[PDB]
Amino acid sequence: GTFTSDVSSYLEGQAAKEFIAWLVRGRG
Amino acid sequence: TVSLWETVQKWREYRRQCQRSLTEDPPPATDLFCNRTFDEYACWPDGEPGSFVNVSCPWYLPWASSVPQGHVYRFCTAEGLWLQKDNSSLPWRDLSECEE
Numbered sequence: 463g464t465f466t467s468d469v470s471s472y473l474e475g476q477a478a479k480e481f482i483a484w485l486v487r488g489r490g
Numbered sequence: 491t492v493s494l495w496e497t498v499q500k501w502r503e504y505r506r507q508c509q510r511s512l513t514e515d516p517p518p519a520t521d522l523f524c525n526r527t528f529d530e531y532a533c534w535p536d537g538e539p540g541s542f543v544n545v546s547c548p549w550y551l552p553w554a555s556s557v558p559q560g561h562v563y564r565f566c567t568a569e570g571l572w573l574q575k576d577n578s579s580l581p582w583r584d585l586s587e588c589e590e
């Protein structure tokens with residue numbers, strides 16, 4: 463199953479992925 | 491896992507290396523080549539008219555190790571303009587090979 467630490471890692475990972483998405487949009 | 495700050499630092503270095511190339515790379519054979527640019531995601535070189543331009547998936551991506559042979563594409567038109575997206579001044583790009 464899933465543990466809190468899975469969620470906290472997911473959230474950290476998503477911060478970087480959102481940064482990439484922001485670059486792909488042109489960093490506006 | 492890969493952090494935001496680690497990724498930002500790698501991006502800043504990718505950008506630094508790109509700006510060096512933009513400055514130092516010699517002029518293209520003719521002004522009909524499409525022009526080099528950094529578009530915040532990838533570093534594009536000048537392009538031959540009427541051809542696809544490919545660059546490696548940017549190495550700062552958190553998942554770069556999973557797309558080691560991936561490329562992102564633009565198309566340089568015969569007029570020396572990057573192919574554009576409809577209803578837009580923005581360039582057409584295919585980044586599908588570099589997705590997570």
Ligand SMILES: CCCCCCCCOCCOCCOCCOCCOCCOCCO
Nearest residue numbers: 473474475476477478479480481482484494498
């Ligand atoms: C070029 C200088 C940039 C240095 C620091 C990075 C900031 C750039 O961020 C731009 C947008 O990206 C957001 C980064 O991630 C935060 C988004 O949320 C992801 C997981 O965090 C949870 C936050 O929840 C609130 C979101 O609505």
Ligand SMILES: CCCCCCCCOCCOCCOCCOCCOCCOCCO
Nearest residue numbers: 541542563564565566573574575576582583584
């Ligand atoms: C350089 C890479 C080029 C990528 C091209 C991406 C797609 C852009 O497409 C724009 C579409 O132009 C052709 C017209 O659209 C297709 C219409 O064909 C019919 C659609 O399928 C079923 C519904 O029919 C509607 C027609 O009445």
